[PDB]
Amino acid sequence: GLMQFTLPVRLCKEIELFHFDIGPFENMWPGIFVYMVHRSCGTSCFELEKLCRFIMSVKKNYRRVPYHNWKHAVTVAHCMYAILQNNHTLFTDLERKGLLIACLCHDLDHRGFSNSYLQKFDHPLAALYSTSTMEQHHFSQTVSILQLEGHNIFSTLSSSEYEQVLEIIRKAIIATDLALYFGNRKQLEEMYQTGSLNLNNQSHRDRVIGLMMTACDLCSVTKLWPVTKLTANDIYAEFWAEGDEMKKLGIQPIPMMDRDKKDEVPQGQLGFYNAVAIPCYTTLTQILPPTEPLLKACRDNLSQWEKVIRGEE
Numbered sequence: 001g002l003m004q005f006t007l008p009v010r011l012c013k014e015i016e017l018f019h020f021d022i023g024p025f026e027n028m029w030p031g032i033f034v035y036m037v038h039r040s041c042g043t044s045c046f047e048l049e050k051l052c053r054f055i056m057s058v059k060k061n062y063r064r065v066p067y068h069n070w071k072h073a074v075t076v077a078h079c080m081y082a083i084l085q086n087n088h089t090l091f092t093d094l095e096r097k098g099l100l101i102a103c104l105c106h107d108l109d110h111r112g113f114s115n116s117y118l119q120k121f122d123h124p125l126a127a128l129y130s131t132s133t134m135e136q137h138h139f140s141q142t143v144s145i146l147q148l149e150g151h152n153i154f155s156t157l158s159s160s161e162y163e164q165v166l167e168i169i170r171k172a173i174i175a176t177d178l179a180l181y182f183g184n185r186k187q188l189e190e191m192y193q194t195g196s197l198n199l200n201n202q203s204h205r206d207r208v209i210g211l212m213m214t215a216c217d218l219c220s221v222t223k224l225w226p227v228t229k230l231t232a233n234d235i236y237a238e239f240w241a242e243g244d245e246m247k248k249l250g251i252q253p254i255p256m257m258d259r260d261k262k263d264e265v266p267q268g269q270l271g272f273y274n275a276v277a278i279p280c281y282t283t284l285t286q287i288l289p290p291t292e293p294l295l296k297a298c299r300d301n302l303s304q305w306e307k308v309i310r311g312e313e
């Protein structure tokens, strides 16, 4: 009741910034997440006992893969926390509750392989879910954990509030399928520019929350250069293992996944920053101006990748 989570001073101040790194001490990540729910939502949003039991079951259903792991989950939630705290008055009580949970849960039981590899391997999940294969699985794992005894953090919601929060989480998690991002951003670009964009239109909120989910998901490109660069090593460690597996099925992987194109990594980052990251944070900054520090940070890491190509590192 009268129990606030607090953080040491450097974390208490830096967690409020977009570029915060949750650090290498795993055992502090649950408390960092609770701290963020408390300040973003309130000490009354969730019963502490249920929340803690929920957090630990979520942690236990993330696997020890190089990138799509528990650290990524808390990282993506911290970015959402930053967006929600800098746009306080734009979001409902249900959205605040639902979106940090969605971020923690958005990659549950990831195996380090893309939807494409699941479809080429012919994995059972690819028969159950023809599109956004892993993302329907992640939402499925979230509902499972919510239904374990002592884990219903939403137990105090009405029947219809419950259904609205699970529907926010489902759409938030689906939107993390980057195949969906391009069209979603295009539509938001056009609606913003013709001034049709309308935050009372629920289908418009849906798209804006979807672009926030892509922004939070890609936030490794918005960190200090040493964090960005070392995270890229984890990202490629998965993609190259996927490349190896593709070759094992008798298939040339795409260049992104072929460890024989290690030398081309700087140029692949440029493409990625130009085709995905920069457009993502641009459109987000237009729609929510106080998210601009993500665009500024993204542009700085693009310069760092340009510097790498030029031999300046």
Ligand SMILES: Cc1nc(C)c2nc(CCc3nc(N4CCCC4)nn3C)nn2c1C
Pocket: 217, 218, 219, 220, 221, 232, 235, 255, 256, 257, 261, 262, 263, 264, 265, 266, 267, 268, 269, 271, 272
């Ligand atoms: C946060 C984040 N999230 C995602 C999903 C992601 N994907 C990537 C790979 C980009 C990439 N590399 C290459 N190649 C490398 C050498 C040969 C081709 N092509 N492309 C497109 N970085 N990345 C980051 C940093």
Ligand SMILES: [Mg+2]
Pocket: 106, 107, 134, 176, 177
């Ligand atoms: Mg994912």
Ligand SMILES: [Zn+2]
Pocket: 072, 076, 106, 107, 176, 217
């Ligand atoms: Zn993710």
